[PDB]
Write a protein that binds this DNA or RNA. Structure first.
Ligand SMILES: [K+]
Ligand SMILES: [K+]
Ligand SMILES: [K+]
Ligand SMILES: [Mg+2]
Ligand SMILES: [Mg+2]
Ligand SMILES: [Mg+2]
Ligand SMILES: [Mg+2]
Ligand SMILES: [Mg+2]
Ligand SMILES: [Mg+2]
Ligand SMILES: [Mg+2]
Ligand SMILES: [Mg+2]
Ligand SMILES: [Mg+2]
Ligand SMILES: [Mg+2]
Ligand SMILES: [Mg+2]
Ligand SMILES: [Mg+2]
Ligand SMILES: [Mg+2]
Ligand SMILES: [Mg+2]
Ligand code: NA
Length: 63
RNA sequence: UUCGCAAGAGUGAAACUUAAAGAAAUUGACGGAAUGGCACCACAAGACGUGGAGCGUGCGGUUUAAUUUGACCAACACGGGGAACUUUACCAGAUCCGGACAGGAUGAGGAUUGACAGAUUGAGUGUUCUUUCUCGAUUCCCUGAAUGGUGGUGCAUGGCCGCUUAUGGUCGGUGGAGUGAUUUGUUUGGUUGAUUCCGUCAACGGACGAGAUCCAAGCUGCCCAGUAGAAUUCAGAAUUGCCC
RNA sequence: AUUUGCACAAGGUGAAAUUUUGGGCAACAGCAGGUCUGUGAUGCUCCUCAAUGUUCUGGGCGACACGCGCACUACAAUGUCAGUGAGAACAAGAAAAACGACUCGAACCUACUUGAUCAAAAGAGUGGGGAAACCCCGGAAUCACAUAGACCCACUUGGGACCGAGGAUUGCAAUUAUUGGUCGCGCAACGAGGAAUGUCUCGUAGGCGCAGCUCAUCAAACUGUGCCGAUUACGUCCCU
């Protein structure tokens, strides 16, 4: 017998057009690129309401 | 019912129950039955102990969430088992899939992987949520069947080990004897640790085991040493005579 | 003892005199002996995604009124301390398709020196060794000492169990003391052990250490090794 609720398995979410919202004829990238040279271009830092985050190298820029 | 003084004797069922009971021989095993041998896992002559104390360790019991389990001469410092984590098989929790593959959904208008921060939490563990980034077709979702398991069953097994069993034991062929199971060979005697030999003989011929082989140790030959040593010369240095 | 034969007993010879000594191997039949906890040995069966798989965290396998088997230490003067001497043998020792340099280095063992103008245990350097090469002339302790040393028959300078404080080391982690080292505790029993019971015949028993093994750390275990070394019998079938 267990008392804690069962932990669900993590499912990946999606935006279904996530590349469109990164860019903005003239094209501008709405996401600041990763300054880390290893990640390079094409890796965009996340835009959280608190800080910026890189998916590859986990670099974090606090506001 | 007859006989008897009586004890009883003669005569003599059935109901019911039961698959054997018996008989003679054979091979084992056993004997508080004989005979001959043998062993310090036996004794004799003894020696050191153990059993008494403290402590180490293993086993049991008790306790515990768990105190994981096997083994009870031939279990108990034994599983090479002297476990802090691991080991670990037990207990309280928490991850991962290491469910290949096949079939069917979703699916690059994205199947999926991994994560900073703040919460969850034992965890500064993305284990889960909020949040979005990231990786891209490796996964994920469902059914089947696979996989792994110090899960069971050693009374399903292999292999290995222990023990019977440290003694001298074991088996055919052909021949003899019995209806046969079986027996002789494989033996009365002496000898040997020895079914070891010598003799004897309804046997003769063999095959294992014992012995032999093998490994060390003690004596020794050859060979050999800038990875072993020795002796002898010079050269240096030390003691040097009255001392008690 | 002997018709013979097979042999035996003493003594010679000899390093060795009867399976030379000690081991290894060891038949045929078996046992419902043990092992499914060695294996990618294995049949059947059980679990299999909040798993009996796997990993991680923490506990446990060590818990203690007790019983039992094995071992270690003792009960002291054939002694305990303190000092000095002479003196073994088996043995072990370091690493990669990875880490740095560019094939070599480091892991392992050990010697020497310092620490040290002041305890041990440490900590550090400098070398050496792939092991007949370094350790190493392997300074083991039982032992010895005419050491003119202390103790003097007492649970005592026997015994060293239990426990308290300091400090060091191994490890990612030492609390349930990991293990050494220091000062205390010693007033914990134990003064030779009932009934029963184990092993042993010569370099043996007993006593004494040392190495390997398990091992990052830890031996009262085991597997070997050497050292000091006897009493007794060399017989029997009374017991098993
Ligand atoms: K016949
Ligand atoms: K037999
Ligand atoms: K002390
Ligand atoms: Mg009558
Ligand atoms: Mg005898
Ligand atoms: Mg026996
Ligand atoms: Mg044992
Ligand atoms: Mg664990
Ligand atoms: Mg298995
Ligand atoms: Mg069996
Ligand atoms: Mg078997
Ligand atoms: Mg016969
Ligand atoms: Mg005889
Ligand atoms: Mg005979
Ligand atoms: Mg145990
Ligand atoms: Mg003392
Ligand atoms: Mg052991
Ligand atoms: Na099985």
């Amino acid at each position: 017998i267990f008392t804690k609720p069962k932990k669900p398995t993590h499912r990946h979410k999606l935006e279904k057009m996530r590349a469109l919202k990164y860019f903005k004829y003239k094209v501008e990238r709405t996401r600041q690129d990763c300054p880390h040279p290893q990640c390079g271009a094409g890796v965009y830092m996340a835009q959280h309401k608190d800080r910026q985050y890189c998916g590859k190298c986990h670099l974090t820029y606090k506001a």
